[PDB]
C-alpha cells in the first residue's frame, strides 16, 4: 500500500500538464505523416508488395514502428489525465441539476418521468445510497421528504428514493456517532457497484470523451502495415477556432440542403426517362467499329451516366453526346439541351453553393455580436454605455469598482468560510435568499447613481 | 532606385518600375490592399485545402493506382500514382485547375471492377473542393470590398 501514495502522486504529474502533453501529438503527427510521402509500390518484395522507398539518411528504420508506439503512448497517458482531471466535474454537472430538480420539481414523484433520452437512464441513481457522493449537499433525501413525503404515501416516498430502513432510522442518528476505522483495500467491493454502472453510462455519453477515445483506436490500429496514421491529422487539426467555423458551417444547415439535393435527384430522373424513351439512338459512345455500350439501354445505366458526367460536365449534357445536326428531330434536342442547361447547372448548383456560403453570413456575425455587447452593456444591470460616456472613462471605471462580474465569485467564496453567527445584517440577508434560489438581488437597471441622480452627482 | 541602377544590365528589369508606382492611384490601392487586409484569415484556410486533397491523394494511391495511366504510346512507365510525392503534385497541378473535377483527365471508369466506387470518389471530390472550398476563398477576397 506504500506505492499507492506515489501512484496517486505520479498521476498528479500527468494532470499537471495535460494540454502540453496533448500538444506533442500535433508535432509528432506531422513527422510520422510527412515522411510517409516517400512510399513506392512495386511488384517485388524488398500478389504485390507495398514496398517502401527511403532516402540516403539513416532514419526511417524500423524505429518508425517505435515511432508508431511513441505516438500511441503519448496519447495513452491522455486517457488517464482526462479521466483524472476532466471527469470529476462531469459527474458534478449531472449531480447538481438533479438535486436542484428535486428541490423544486417532483417529475420523478408527482406526474411522471419524461422521449426520455438521458433522462430514463437517471432512474438508476435514485435507489443508489451514494447519490450525493460528488455534489455539495449530502442530505437531499431529507428535504424532498419534507415537502412531498407527507402529502403522498410517506412509506412510498421513503422507499422509491432509497432510505434503506431510514423510515425508523431517521431519528436513530441523533444520540451519538462512533467513528469506525478505515477498511480500504479490504472491503472495497462493498460499494455501490450499481451506481458504478450509472457513472460509466454517463461517461460513454460524453461528447468529448468519445472523440479522444476514438482517436486512440486508429493509433492502435495504425500499427498494421497501413497509412491509418494520416487520419490522426484531420480530427485534431480542426482544433483551430477559425477552422472550426468552416467545418461546422455544413453541419449548421444540414437540415436544409438534405431536402434540396433530393430535388436534384428527381429532376434528372425526368430528363433520364425522356431521353431513354425517345433520344436513345443518339448517345452512342462509339467504341471502335462496334456499339454495344449504349448508356440508354438499361433503366439504371442511363441514370448513372447523367450524374457521373452531366452534373460534373460544367457546360451541360451536350458536351459528351453526339452531334444533333441530323435532319430528324434537329429542333427537339436543342429544346432538350438548353432546358437542361438552365434547370440544373445555372440554378440548382448555385442554390446549393448559396446555402453553404450563406452559413458564414451568420457565423461571422455571431463573432461580432459578442464584441458589441462588451462595448455597450455591462451584462449585470440593464444599462448601456451611453450614460457612462457622459463622464470620461465612465464605462471604463464601471468595470473596476462597480459590478465587474468577477468579484462576485470571491464574494460567495467568503460566505462559506464565515459562520452563521458572524454574518452581518446584510450578509445573512443574501445567504437565506440565495438558498431559496431567487435572484432579485442583482441590480438590473440601476448602479448606485440613477437612484442618486438628483440627490448628489 | 536599386532596380533602376540594376536595370542597366541587358535585361527587362525596367518593367518592374511600372508596378510599384502605378499603385499610387487611390482606387487601385484599395484593390491591392484588400488581400493584405484579410491575410490572417485565408492563410489558415488554404492550409485546409492542402490537407483535404492529401486524404484523396493517399486513398487513390492505395486502391485506384491502376486507373490513372496517362498512356503514352505503347508503354506506361509514367504513372502518377507511383511515388508518394508524385501523385500529390499531380492533383494540385491538374485537379484544382481542371474546373470540373478530377474525372476529366483520368481514364474511363466504365470497367466492371469497382465501377460504383469511382463515382463515389469522383462525385465527392466535385463537392468538397471545387464547389465549396474555392467559392469560400473567392468569398473572403470579394468581401474585402464589402
Amino acid at each position: 500500500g506504500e506505492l499507492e501514495v506515489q501512484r496517486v502522486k505520479f498521476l498528479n504529474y500527468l494532470s499537471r500538464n495535460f494540454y502540453t502533453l496533448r500538444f506533442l501529438a500535433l508535432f509528432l503527427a506531422f513527422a510520422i505523416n510527412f515522411i510517409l510521402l516517400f512510399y513506392k509500390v512495386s511488384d517485388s518484395p524488398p500478389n504485390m508488395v507495398y514496398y517502401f522507398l527511403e532516402e540516403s539518411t539513416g532514419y526511417m528504420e524500423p524505429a518508425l514502428w517505435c515511432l508508431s508506439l511513441l505516438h500511441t503512448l503519448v496519447a495513452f497517458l491522455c486517457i488517464i489525465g482526462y479521466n483524472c482531471l476532466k471527469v470529476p466535474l462531469v459527474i458534478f454537472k449531472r449531480e447538481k441539476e438533479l438535486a436542484r430538480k428535486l428541490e423544486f420539481d417532483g417529475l420523478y414523484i408527482t406526474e411522471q418521468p419524461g422521449d426520455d433520452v438521458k433522462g430514463q437512464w437517471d432512474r438508476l441513481v435514485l435507489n443508489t445510497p451514494s447519490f450525493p457522493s460528488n455534489y455539495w449537499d449530502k442530505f437531499v433525501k431529507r428535504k424532498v421528504l419534507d415537502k412531498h413525503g407527507d402529502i403522498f404515501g410517506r412509506e412510498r416516498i421513503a422507499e422509491l428514493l432509497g432510505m434503506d430502513l431510514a423510515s425508523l432510522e431517521i431519528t436513530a442518528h441523533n444520540e451519538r456517532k462512533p467513528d469506525p476505522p478505515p477498511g480500504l483495500l479490504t472491503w472495497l467491493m462493498s460499494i455501490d457497484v450499481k451506481y458504478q454502472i450509472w457513472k460509466f453510462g454517463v461517461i460513454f455519453t460524453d461528447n468529448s470523451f468519445l472523440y479522444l477515445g476514438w482517436y486512440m483506436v486508429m493509433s492502435l490500429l495504425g500499427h498494421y502495415n497501413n497509412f491509418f496514421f494520416a487520419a490522426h491529422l484531420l480530427d485534431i487539426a480542426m482544433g483551430v477556432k477559425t477552422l472550426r467555423t468552416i467545418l461546422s458551417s455544413v453541419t449548421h444547415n444540414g437540415k436544409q440542403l438534405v431536402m434540396t439535393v433530393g430535388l436534384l435527384a428527381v429532376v434528372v430522373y425526368l430528363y433520364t426517362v425522356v431521353a431513354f424513351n425517345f433520344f436513345r439512338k443518339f448517345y452512342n459512345k462509339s467504341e471502335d467499329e462496334d456499339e454495344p455500350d449504349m448508356k440508354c439501354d438499361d433503366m439504371m445505366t442511363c441514370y448513372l451516366f447523367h450524374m457521373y458526367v452531366g452534373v460534373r460536365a460544367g457546360g451541360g449534357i451536350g458536351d459528351e453526346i453526339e452531334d444533333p445536326a441530323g435532319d430528324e428531330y434537329e429542333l427537339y434536342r436543342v429544346v432538350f439541351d438548353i432546358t437542361f442547361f438552365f434547370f440544373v447547372i445555372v440554378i440548382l448548383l448555385a442554390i446549393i453553393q448559396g446555402l453553404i456560403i450563406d452559413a458564414f453570413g451568420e457565423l461571422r456575425d455571431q463573432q461580432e455580436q459578442v464584441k458589441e455587447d462588451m462595448e455597450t452593456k455591462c451584462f449585470i444591470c440593464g444599462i448601456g454605455s451611453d450614460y457612462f460616456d457622459t463622464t470620461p472613462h465612465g464605462f471604463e471605471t464601471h468595470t473596476l469598482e462597480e459590478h465587474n462580474l468577477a468579484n462576485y465569485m470571491f464574494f460567495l467564496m467568503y460566505l462559506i468560510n464565515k459562520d452563521e453567527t458572524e454574518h452581518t445584517g446584510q450578509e445573512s440577508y443574501v445567504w437565506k435568499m440565495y438558498q431559496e434560489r431567487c435572484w432579485d438581488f442583482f441590480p438590473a437597471g440601476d448602479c448606485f447613481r440613477k437612484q442618486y441622480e438628483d440627490q448628489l452627482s | 532606385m536599386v532596380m533602376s541602377l540594376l536595370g542597366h544590365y541587358n535585361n527587362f528589369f525596367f518593367a518592374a518600375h511600372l508596378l510599384d508606382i502605378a499603385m499610387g492611384v487611390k482606387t487601385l490601392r484599395t484593390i491591392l490592399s484588400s488581400v493584405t487586409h484579410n491575410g490572417k484569415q485565408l492563410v489558415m484556410t488554404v492550409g485546409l485545402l492542402a490537407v483535404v486533397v492529401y486524404l484523396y491523394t493517399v486513398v487513390a494511391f492505395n486502391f485506384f493506382r491502376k486507373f490513372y495511366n496517362k498512356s503514352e504510346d505503347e508503354d506506361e512507365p509514367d504513372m502518377k500514382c507511383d511515388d508518394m510525392m508524385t501523385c500529390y503534385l499531380f492533383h494540385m497541378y491538374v485537379g484544382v485547375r481542371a474546373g470540373g473535377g478530377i474525372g476529366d483527365e483520368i481514364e474511363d471508369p466504365a470497367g466492371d471492377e469497382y465501377e460504383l466506387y469511382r463515382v463515389v470518389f469522383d462525385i465527392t471530390f466535385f463537392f468538397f473542393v471545387i464547389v465549396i472550398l474555392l467559392a469560400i476563398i473567392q468569398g473572403l477576397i470579394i468581401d474585402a470590398f464589402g
Binding site: 431536402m259 433530393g262 435527384a265 438499361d298 439504371m300 | 471492377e113 469497382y114 460504383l116 466506387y117
Partner: peptide
Amino acid sequence: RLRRLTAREAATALAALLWAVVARAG
C-alpha cells in the same frame, strides 16, 4: 480489395435513405 456493389443493392440502399429522409419530415 472490397465487396463489388451491383446496381440493385446500391439503388435499394440509396432509395431507403431517400425515403427515410422524406418520412422524417413527411
